Amino acid sequence: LSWYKDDEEKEKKYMLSVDNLKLRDVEKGFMSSKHIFALFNTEQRNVYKD
């Protein structure tokens, strides 16, 4: 999984994996509208750069 600042596909600072990951939601009190869910991993330390 990658994240770019534009559509030209030239950011490529870091490419985040997909397999061996977990999923949680944000803490209570936060406004999901704009639904934000957090990625982390309990098996590995691959978050990445939490």
Side-chain angles (χ1 to χ4, degrees):
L1 174 65
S2 296
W3 56 87
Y4 296 149
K5 69 179 179 66
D6 52 356
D7 195 74
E8 70 182 1
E9 190 176 1
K10 289 297 291 183
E11 180 69 28
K12 60 183 180 181
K13 180 63 70 177
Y14 181 76
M15 183 177 71
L16 182 60
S17 178
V18 175
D19 291 331
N20 196 0
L21 291 175
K22 298 292 180 68
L23 189 147
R24 72 175 69 187
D25 291 331
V26 295
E27 65 183 1
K28 65 182 181 180
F30 187 77
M31 185 180 288
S32 296
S33 178
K34 291 191 263 77
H35 298 89
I36 300 173
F37 61 96
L39 295 175
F40 70 103
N41 192 1
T42 309
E43 184 71 27
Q44 294 178 356
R45 293 290 186 269
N46 192 1
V47 178
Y48 183 75
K49 191 69 175 177
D50 189 75

